């Protein structure tokens, strides 16, 4: 229905997601161990956008949008081989970002790990 | 046909009125149009920060401006020739929008017609005046005029909207062109000439009209920056002190100087100072109360911004029916008893805003804008003292007074009332108290940047206290600074009631 | 919508359940009270603004509330009893400004009644 998009491990990756409006709407991104898909950081589309980070990730994570073509670049540090996880990326939720909840869209996501 | 015509009009010049009245209603309905169009061009073009604030400051900083001079020039070029350029410009303007090369063509186009609306609103009124050459008559005339000019904030937003809602935005100034033109179409068939005499017309003053465009320029835009800004910035401090300086230097030359600009001698009556205050204060009311209750609508009751405006239609038809009673009741309880009944009638009806609706419903939101509007149909009372003893000439000096006085006064009202809302707002909510359990930073600053901000971030962040407390606090907010401006109103109606001498009257001019 | 406030927990330390009706945002916006038999109704364990949590000078550490947002309801514990309680321990809902709850001032909404036998 969409598109989507992957990265490269270490350094950090970035996804897509054509189509879409994002007016009001959440969109961010997930990851899960081989258990749930917690959660990383996400942009609520409000003047500028409202940024949203997790507890365990926050400053080392950058997130933007870009209004040119719907991307979800992405950017870090500190690439602890740790958060290995199966990423994916999200949106069209009406609320309550970074939480596994009402989406009316889902990616395939990216295979990413750190050894 | 022809410009100069003597004897004034015959009997049907009421319809002239008419034909100048609904023409300013339109005229005053622009900036509205302009302000919930400005997120669609923002869509459409590059906003590019600062100017997409000067695309809505400079229609204002111009009209404030551009004031004084300009009812100078249309004395000695001729009132009625000064109101159809003025109305011809500003069609003009208005079809060159229909070029996008969105860029300082905006800007531009929205200085030069701000130039052109400068010569309206100035003119009209003292057009009124050189018609109506009779107390009884001129009471009932400016009545009309009154109504317009305001009835126009009110029904800004809805007729806006439903333009937005179908069309685009460059028919925000296309439904202008077509009303405009029709009025010159009259404006030259039903119109007299004025054309004030060279015998006490010297050459025209050029540190005069300098040093006036200059004070009042930098007075409005201090008021804008301190609102903005906060009174921590030093230029603001310096514009505003050098604006004050050159302003006593412009009263200083009018005073004793011959043939001046601005005859400031009319402040020496009572008749006239009563008016020139009451305007202002009138004016504070709804600069306040119509911004703060379309947040109110937008926020607690969940509407669209075209709703939220038309859910405000009590206050413009509370006005729409006091108005046309006031002369009539002025006439026969003389105007020391009914100009300040207005006023103190709003300050009822503001008070009831907090006394008796601490949690504000839209019944009792309705329920005082009827008495909001009737302090706005007072204007009609007070517009007829000011010009009640005054020649010719001298009224058509003071109606730029009187315009003038009106927009510092909404000026004013706006960015007072407006930051003490949002200080009071900001401390009720107390967002400090909601770090450690989720908002902390950047998000914090748009919970105190504004009550719907507030909102939205408690909907994202999944914290849902935010949502009610901020909601709560922006009631509270709202509500204190409708008892503020309460108190402000009953003060100056004490002042207004002790101004008017007991002699004076609305009829029997002498 | 009209509010309806259930109870339930009370009879025979006990937990005191309060369920929710219609309401957006419904949390942080349920208080408890309770008419003593002696004295007057009072305030036991309500919210502040903000986030504070205002328990009676009495029961101030023996009693405890908490809430959960899925299956909207309010539950109070009370441990380590007294010569007081009793009471009916109604429970409450804030007053509604249009569709959110919060507003300073005191409730509209009363619930039930009795049974809390201490």
């Known amino acids: 229905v969409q598109l989507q998009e992957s990265g490269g491990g270490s350094l950090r990756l970035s996804c897509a997601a054509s189509g879409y409006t994002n007016s009001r709407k959440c969109m961010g991104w997930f990851r899960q161990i081989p258990k749930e898909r917690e959660g990383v950081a996400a942009i609520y589309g409000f003047g500028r956008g409202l940024i949203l980070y997790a507890d365990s990730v926050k400053g080392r994570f950058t997130i933007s949008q870009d209004n040119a073509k719907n991307t979800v670049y992405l950017q870090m540090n500190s690439l602890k081989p740790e958060d290995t996880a199966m990423y994916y990326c999200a949106a069209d939720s009406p609320g309550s970002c970074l939480s596994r909840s009402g989406y009316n869209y889902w990616g395939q996501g990216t295979q990413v790990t750190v050894s | 046909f022809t410009k100069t015509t003597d004897m004034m009009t015959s009997k049907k010049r009421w319809t002239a009125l008419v034909v100048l009245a609904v023409s300013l209603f339109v005229v005053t309905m622009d900036m509205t149009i302009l302000i919930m169009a400005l997120p669609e061009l923002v869509r459409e073009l590059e906003p590019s920060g600062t100017q997409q604030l000067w695309i809505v400051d400079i229609y204002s900083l111009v009209l404030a401006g551009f004031i004084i001079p300009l009812s100078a020039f249309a004395d000695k070029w001729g009132r009625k020739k000064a109101l159809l350029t003025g109305f011809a410009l500003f069609g003009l303007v208005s079809l060159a929008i229909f070029f996008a090369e969105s860029a300082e063509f905006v800007i531009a186009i929205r200085f030069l017609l701000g130039i052109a609306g400068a010569l309206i609103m100035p003119t009209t009124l003292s057009m009124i005046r050189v018609i109506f050459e009779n107390p009884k008559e001129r009471a009932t005339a400016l009545a009309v005029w009154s109504i317009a000019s305001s009835i126009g904030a009110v029904f800004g937003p809805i007729i806006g909207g439903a333009l937005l809602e179908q069309f685009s935005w460059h028919s925000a100034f296309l439904i202008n062109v077509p009303f405009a033109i029709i009025a010159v179409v009259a404006g030259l068939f039903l119109l007299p000439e004025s054309k004030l005499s060279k015998e006490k017309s010297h050459s025209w003053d050029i540190p005069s009209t300098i040093l006036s465009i200059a004070g009042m320029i930098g007075l409005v835009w201090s008021i804008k920056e301190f609102s903005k800004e906060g009174l921590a910035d030093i230029i603001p401090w310096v514009v505003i002190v050098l604006a004050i300086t050159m302003i006593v230097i412009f009263v200083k030359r009018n005073l004793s100087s011959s043939d001046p600009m601005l005859d400031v001698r009319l402040f020496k009556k009572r008749s006239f100072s009563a008016g020139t205050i009451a305007a202002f204060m009138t004016m504070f009311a709804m600069a306040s109360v119509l911004l703060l209750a379309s947040q109110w609508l937008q926020v607690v009751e969940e509407l669209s911004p075209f709703k939220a405006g038309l859910y405000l239609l009590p206050m413009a038809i509370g006005d729409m029916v006091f108005a046309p009673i006031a002369p009539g009741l002025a006439a026969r309880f003389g105007p020391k008893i009914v100009l300040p009944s207005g006023i103190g009638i709003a300050a009822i009806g503001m008070f009831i805003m907090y006394f008796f609706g601490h949690p504000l419903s839209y019944s009792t939101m309705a329920l005082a804008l009827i008495l909001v509007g009737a302090g706005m149909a007072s204007l009609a009372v007070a517009s007829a003292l000011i010009m009640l003893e005054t020649p010719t000439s001298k009224a058509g000096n003071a109606a730029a007074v009187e315009e003038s006085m009106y927009n510092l006064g909404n000026v004013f009202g706006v960015a007072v009332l407006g930051s003490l809302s949002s200080m009071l707002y900001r401390v009720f909510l107390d967002i400090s108290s909601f770090s450690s359990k989720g908002i902390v930073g950047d998000l914090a600053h748009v919970a105190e940047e504004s009550v719907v901000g507030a909102v939205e971030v408690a909907k994202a962040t999944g914290i849902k206290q935010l949502a009610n407390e901020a909601v709560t606090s922006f009631n509270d907010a709202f509500v204190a600074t409708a008892l503020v401006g309460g108190i402000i109103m009953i003060i100056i109606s004490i002042v207004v009631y002790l101004l008017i001498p007991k002699s004076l009257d609305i009829t029997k001019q002498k | ?118």
């Open chain 3, 1 to 118: 919508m009209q509010v309806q406030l259930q109870e339930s927990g009370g009879g025979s330390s006990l937990r005191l359940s309060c369920a929710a009706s219609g309401y957006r945002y419904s949390d942080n916006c349920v208080g408890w009270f309770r008419q003593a038999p002696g004295r007057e109704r009072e305030a036991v364990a309500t919210y502040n603004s903000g986030s504070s949590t205002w328990y009676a000078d009495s029961v101030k550490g023996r009693f405890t509330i908490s809430q959960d947002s899925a299956k909207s309801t309010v539950y109070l514990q009370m441990n380590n009893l007294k010569p007081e309680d009793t009471a009916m321990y109604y429970c409450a809902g804030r007053n509604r400004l249009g569709s959110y709850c919060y507003m300073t001032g005191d409730f509209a909404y009363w619930g039930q009644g009795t049974q809390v036998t201490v």
